[PDB]
Amino acid sequence: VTCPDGHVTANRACCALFPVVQNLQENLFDGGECGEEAHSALRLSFHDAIGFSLNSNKGGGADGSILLFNATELTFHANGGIDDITSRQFPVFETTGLTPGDFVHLAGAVGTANCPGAPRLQFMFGRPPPIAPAPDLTVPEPTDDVDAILARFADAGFDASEVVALLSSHTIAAADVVDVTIPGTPFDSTVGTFDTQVFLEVLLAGRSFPGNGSQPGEVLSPLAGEMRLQSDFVVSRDSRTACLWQAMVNNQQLMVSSFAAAMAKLQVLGQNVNTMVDCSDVIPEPAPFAGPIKFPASFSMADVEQACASTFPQIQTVAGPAPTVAPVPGS
Ligand code: HEM
Ligand SMILES: [Ca+2]
Ligand SMILES: [Ca+2]
Ligand SMILES: [Mg+2]
Ligand SMILES: [Mg+2]
Ligand SMILES: [Mg+2]
Ligand SMILES: [Mn+2]
Numbered sequence: 001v002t003c004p005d006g007h008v009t010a011n012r013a014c015c016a017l018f019p020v021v022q023n024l025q026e027n028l029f030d031g032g033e034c035g036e037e038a039h040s041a042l043r044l045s046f047h048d049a050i051g052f053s054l055n056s057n058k059g060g061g062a063d064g065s066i067l068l069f070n071a072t073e074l075t076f077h078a079n080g081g082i083d084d085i086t087s088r089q090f091p092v093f094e095t096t097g098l099t100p101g102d103f104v105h106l107a108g109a110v111g112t113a114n115c116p117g118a119p120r121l122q123f124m125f126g127r128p129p130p131i132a133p134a135p136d137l138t139v140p141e142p143t144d145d146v147d148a149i150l151a152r153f154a155d156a157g158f159d160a161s162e163v164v165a166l167l168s169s170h171t172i173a174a175a176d177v178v179d180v181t182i183p184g185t186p187f188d189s190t191v192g193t194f195d196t197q198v199f200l201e202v203l204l205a206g207r208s209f210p211g212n213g214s215q216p217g218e219v220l221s222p223l224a225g226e227m228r229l230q231s232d233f234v235v236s237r238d239s240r241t242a243c244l245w246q247a248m249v250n251n252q253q254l255m256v257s258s259f260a261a262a263m264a265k266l267q268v269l270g271q272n273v274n275t276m277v278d279c280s281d282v283i284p285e286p287a288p289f290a291g292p293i294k295f296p297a298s299f300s301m302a303d304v305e306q307a308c309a310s311t312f313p314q315i316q317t318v319a320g321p322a323p324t325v326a327p328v329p330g331s
Contacts, residue, residue, distance in 0.1 A: 014125065014279035017106065020096045021282050024110050028092045032284065034192045036184070036328055038111035039172050040085040045108030045267060046169070047073075047082060048101070051134025052269040054157050059134035061156075061270020062127060064100025067093065069133035078139035081177040088331075101127030105267045109283050112263075115172045117194035117252065117289025119260035124268055126276040142178065142217035142229045146238040149231060156269060158262065164244040165258035166266065167235065171198045174328045175227050178218055182211035184327035185227045189296055191328055194286075196255050197293050199248040200315065202228060202236045204296075204303050222303070223296060225325030242307035250293050250313040298322045 002008055003015035025032045028041070048066040051059030051073075059065055066073045067086060074083050093103045102125060109121040140152050153163045171194055176183040188198035206220025210227050221228040236245045248255045268276070297320035306312055 009279070009281055011277050011279065013277045014282055016097070017123075017125065017279055017282040020098060020103075020106065021110055021284070023092060023096060024107055025114075025284070028089065028107060029111060029114055030331065032114050034115035034172060034194075036174075036331055037088060038114045039174065039191075039328070040088070041104075041107040041111035042169055043173070044082065044085050044089070045105055046166070047079060047139055048104045049266045049269045050140075050152075050156055051138045053138075053155050055155060058138050058155075059132065059270070060130050062101055062105055062267050063130035063270055064102070064104045064127060065130035065133050067100035067104060068130050072133040076136045076139070078137070078141050081175075084176065099127050099129050101130065101271075106282075108267070109263075112172075112194070113284040113286045115192065115194040116287040117256070118172075118286045119256045119263075120280070120283050120286055121260060121267070122264040122278075123280045123283050124264075124271070124273060124276040125279040127271055140231065142231045144231055146234050146240060149235065150240065157265065160240050161244055161258070162262045162265070164235065164241055164248065165255075165262040167232065168194075168196075168198075168248065168255045168259040170229070170232060171195055171255075173198075175218075175229075178227065178229075179211035179215045182227075182327065184330065185210050185225065186325055186328060187227055187229065187232070189223060189226060189323060189325050191325075193289055194256075195289055195293055196248050196250055196252055198232075199236075199245060199255070200250070200293060200304075201226065201296070202232045203246070203249070203305055203307070204299060205305055206233075222299070223323060223325055225327065237305070237307040243310060246306070246308040246310060246312070250315055252289065292316065294318055296323050 007018040049062040052061035112118045170187045174184045174186040190197045204222035219230045219233045235241045294316045297318040
């Protein structure tokens with residue numbers, strides 16, 4: 001099929017999406033950047049989709065409920081920071097004609113593709129409008145323990161392997177509301193790169209808080225300007241998840257493959273995949289990221305708090321002063 005747009009595709013139903021993706025890239029992602037809006041779109045995709053249970057009715061999953069029922073879902077504590085994300089998305093969404101769910105999930109996949117090293121995520125298309133808001137408490141909190149995290153994910157259909165896979169997202173992530181004095185504080189020292197740096201950096205001994213001291217949801221971090229979530233800390237070190245976490249360190253392909261597979265499930269939670277169309281070809285091709293990660297300057301294996309009995313990966317050390325991580329620019 002040649003779309004009237006000129007683009008070629010497997011299914012005519014995907015033709016609408018080529019202009020939408022251009023709209024996103026220009027008017028949401030500032031010309032296809034791995035910046036605030038791209039990171040935000042991935043976070044929104046997770047918040048929308050996790051409003052789902054295999055067992056009980058905890059929402060329609062990846063239905064775009066978090067947009068259509070924005071007023072309700074933005075009242076929930078774990079959706080802190082989401083208002084800024086949806087506020088910025090709405091002007092773009094409004095000119096697309098898409099269901100809220102197809103828009104949220106497309107934007108999350110396109111945004112991810114803007115980050116060097118990221119997978120080109122599967123994009124299934126065809127999410128009917130949402131019927132109801134998710135209830136409260138579907139989204140994990142950074143103060144949650146591993147029991148609670150693993151329980152919530154399992155309820156939605158994800159095992160421990162998949163939880164670690166999905167936390168790869170924190171390689172391109174910053175916090176705006178855990179400490180409102182330091183918006184845009186990243187979780188790793190390569191917030192514009194979809195690499196395995198966050199898996200290493202969370203394993204370093206934490207030494208300081210990045211902003212206005214101790215705030216609920218964070219723990220001591222190893223670098224000035226870097227935030228460490230309490231949830232990432234406990235998942236990295238718990239016996240159920242530690243080997244999974246360590247395996248990601250300096251293993252770019254394991255991270256990307258694991259993440260790609262888990263995201264393909266996440267982004268269709270609640271949906272009837274047999275009634276959807278494969279429109280994966282509308283997602284931009286991401287820039288590659290091969291070479292290895294390295295320790296931040298001044299650190300070494302002495303500073304790693306190794307939580308798994310497997311031999312730790314060999315990672316190059318860098319001579320120099322400990323680095324300061326810059327905040328992410330607001331837009
Ligand atoms: C235990 C599970 C999780 C917890 C407790 C958690 C918690 C957090 C917190 C507290 C923030 C900072 C929010 C703010 O202050 O603005 C954040 C950011 C983010 N999270 Fe997670 N998260 C989890 C899982 C995930 C998953 C599964 C994804 C996607 C697959 C995701 C993607 C992101 C992204 C992309 C950001 C960055 C947003 C930005 O830079 O604007 N998270 N997360
Ligand atoms: Ca939802
Ligand atoms: Ca990174
Ligand atoms: Mg383990
Ligand atoms: Mg290992
Ligand atoms: Mg911007
Ligand atoms: Mn943000």
